[PDB]
Amino acid sequence: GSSGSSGESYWRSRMIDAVTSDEDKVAPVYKLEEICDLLRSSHVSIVKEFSEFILKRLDNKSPIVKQKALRLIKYAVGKSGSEFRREMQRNSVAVRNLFHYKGHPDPLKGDALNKAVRETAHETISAIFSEENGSGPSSG
């Protein structure tokens, strides 16, 4: 239009970083939903941008950073829109690649940091390839 495809920003990455930061502590929900808010408020050219910042977090070298994305993703997948859900489907392999993540143990937390990744990825795929009212007739 006036504004068009012309609509990138660097700041949107900072929101994903804020909720994926490198500590044994977790982000509150309200910081997650801000990302979900922007993507509804924003065009496809912005979903593209955002989705990569979220996805490339599974490609990041820490237990924590990954698990944090796996709490964020599903929450936004079931809120944002058509564009965003399929952009997660384009890049879902990275999440899937964590179903059996291990890496190395902690002196106190033991396996818990890496295990927290390894389970949460399943729930994430349960949202990436969610179906519109797709349970109900499911049994077991």
UniProtKB/Swiss-Prot annotation:
VHS domain span: 19-134
Location of this chain's protein in the cell: Golgi apparatus, trans-Golgi network; Cytoplasmic vesicle, Clathrin-coated vesicle
Phenotype seen when the gene is deleted: Abnormal vacuolar trafficking of soluble cargo proteins, and premature termination of the shoot apical meristem and of floral meristems. Plant missing both AGD5 and MTV1 are severely dwarfed, develop short siliques, exhibit abscission defect, and have altered subcellular distribution of clathrin-coated vesicle (CCV) cargo exported from the trans-Golgi network (TGN).
Domain of life: Eukaryota
Tissue: Expressed in inflorescence stems, stigmas, roots, roots meristems, embryos, and floral and leaf vasculatures, but absent from the floral abscission zone.
Quaternary assembly: Binds to clathrin heavy chain.
Purpose: Mediates clathrin-dependent trafficking of vacuolar cargo from the trans-Golgi network (TGN). Promotes plant growth.
Protein name: Protein MODIFIED TRANSPORT TO THE VACUOLE 1
Species lineage: Eukaryota, Viridiplantae, Streptophyta, Embryophyta, Tracheophyta
